[PDB]
Design a protein around this nucleic acid. Structure first.
Lengths: 75, 140, 145
RNA sequence: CGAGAUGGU
RNA sequence: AGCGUGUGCCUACCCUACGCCGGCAGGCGCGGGUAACCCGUUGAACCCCAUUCGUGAUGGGGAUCGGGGAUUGCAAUUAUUCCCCAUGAACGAGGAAUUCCCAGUAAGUGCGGGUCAUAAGCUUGCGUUGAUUAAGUCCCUGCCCUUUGUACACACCGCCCG
RNA sequence: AGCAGAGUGGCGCAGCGGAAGCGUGCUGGGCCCAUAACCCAGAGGUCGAUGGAUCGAAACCAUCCUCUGCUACCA
């Protein structure tokens, strides 16, 4: 029997990584951000809306149960 | 009674009032202190020939020797509510075959007379008999 | 973030400063989901923040509202102690005060030896339930002699 | 071609 | 959506629109219906669209138990049923075994009728969303027909030896 | 005194340096019309004192304690 320990707010070692990792991923989604950065799904939802208003990522699709985002139109 | 303060002065009362005040109040005032079931029973209840117990109780309170307990009045009326008229009184309440005596403490107010005289014996088990389990079968 | 304090002590009980404020204060006994929302609504606190994001004067505003509901116009029909039997007051009872209020209620029933007080003392079901087939907590007994 | 006894209403 | 019920003939109770008071259960007033005519275009649930939570016995689960308020009734304590704040158990897909099912079917989802002064976790009907796997066999448990053997006929759960 | 065992978690037999060990007894359930055979699951848990390595001590190792067993003696 085991436990995760996901963060509720950022710190600079993980917030600078959020801004550096943007071009690396073909698929951007709250769950893949959560497991890869060790972040709660509600912080992953909030972080991906900021990058969209900064113009750094493209929204592919939205629905109640599933958002989808991708890299900024090249590569 | 065994305990000080209660319904006499300061922080222990019924709903904020003393025993001498509960003995001044009318049934119209008193039904604001009782809870919803006792309030419905007093509001709806004409009490046709159920006042006869209260006459026999106040006779026994009147005619007792000075500083000594009344004799028992014995009754079938298990669904009577304890009124503030009934405190410091001896009642025998029927049990389906016998009368059990009660000394009415003032903490009993608003309860039924039938709540203090119980209709059965607490269970304590003897060993299980034949047929109690699937393996218990008897062949001659 | 501010790296602020993320565990805090409120009414002789510990709150995790890591849940949403309306679900952090329900760690206090006497404070359910329904009552915690109404207290924060009278206290003028935004429900969106984490419990470690409240300032020192914001927690004192919530604590002073929980202990005196009737002066901040929380209704009488909301409260967990109504016409208390010994002194006629209306209030909400919290923390170690709720333990003692139940402790006094069970002894008050036992002292006059009413049927409720005897069922609580013998350890049996107090409300109307049957006892032949449910609530079993002993051991299996064999038929052998 | 494994092992497969017995019989209060 | 679809199937139904409705002023009880001794026996004394029915189904409800609309307005006003109350957080709620509920209360007062005033109309229609003995019914393809009134409740009623029977504004049903799952489902559908948007929000919040974040793998934590957790905002999953709701047993157990304290205090207060209505309604039925001649009477509610061993809590009739209903409403409100609080308390917050076991339980993380279940050992040897074992039941039902082949198409608008299984399973999911809610609504009528019966019993009813008060009241479905039962049962008997109705609609709505809607699959996977088969088109076969006699192996296991049984049924039908024929040939065959018997010391059975109380009929193999039979009869019988030291 | 020479050498060995025990010091339950459930009667009894005492495994091996992993928190029961396995054959057996007891108690309950399945299978059958039913009893035996067979199958499955249960039983509240520092196992005499004092030190030391360990994730760990009835069960890896010291030093004391006591009764048995075979030899056989401080008596």
């Amino acid at each position: 029997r085991d436990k995760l320990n996901n963060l509720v707010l950022f710190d600079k070692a993980t917030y600078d990584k959020l801004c550096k990792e943007v071009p690396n991923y073909k698929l951007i989604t709250p769950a893949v951000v959560s497991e890869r950065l060790k972040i709660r799904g509600s912080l992953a939802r909030a972080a991906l809306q900021e990058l969209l208003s900064k113009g750094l990522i493209k929204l592919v699709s939205k629905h109640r149960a599933q958002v989808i985002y991708t890299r900024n139109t090249k590569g | 009674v065994e305990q000080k303060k209660k319904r006499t002065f300061r922080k222990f009362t019924y709903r904020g009032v003393d025993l001498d005040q509960l003995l001044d109040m009318s049934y119209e005032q008193l039904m604001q202190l009782y809870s919803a079931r006792q309030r419905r029973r007093l509001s709806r209840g004409l009490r046709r020939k159920q006042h006869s117990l209260l006459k026999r109780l106040r006779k026994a309170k009147k005619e007792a020797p000075p500083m000594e307990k009344p004799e028992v009045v014995k009754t079938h009326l298990r669904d009577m509510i304890i009124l503030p008229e009934m405190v410091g009184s001896m009642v025998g309440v029927y049990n389906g075959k016998t009368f059990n005596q009660v000394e009415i403490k003032p903490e009993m107010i608003g309860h039924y007379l039938g709540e203090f005289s119980i209709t059965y014996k607490p269970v304590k088990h003897g060993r299980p008999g034949i047929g109690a389990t699937h393996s218990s079968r008897f062949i001659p | 973030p501010e790296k602020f304090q993320h565990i805090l002590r409120v009414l002789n009980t510990n709150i995790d400063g890591r849940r949403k404020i309306a679900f952090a204060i329900t760690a206090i006994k006497g404070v359910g989901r329904r009552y915690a929302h109404v207290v924060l609504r009278k206290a003028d606190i935004d429900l969106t923040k984490r419990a470690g994001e409240l300032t020192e004067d914001e927690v004192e505003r919530v604590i002073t509202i929980m202990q005196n509901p009737r002066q901040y116009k929380i209704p009488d029909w909301f409260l967990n102690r109504q016409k208390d039997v010994k002194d006629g007051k209306y209030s909400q009872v919290l923390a170690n005060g709720l333990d003692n209020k139940l402790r006094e209620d069970l002894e008050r029933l036992k002292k006059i030896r009413a049927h409720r007080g005897l069922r609580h003392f013998w350890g049996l079901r107090v409300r109307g339930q049957h006892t032949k087939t449910t609530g079993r907590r002993g051991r299996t007994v064999g038929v052998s002699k």
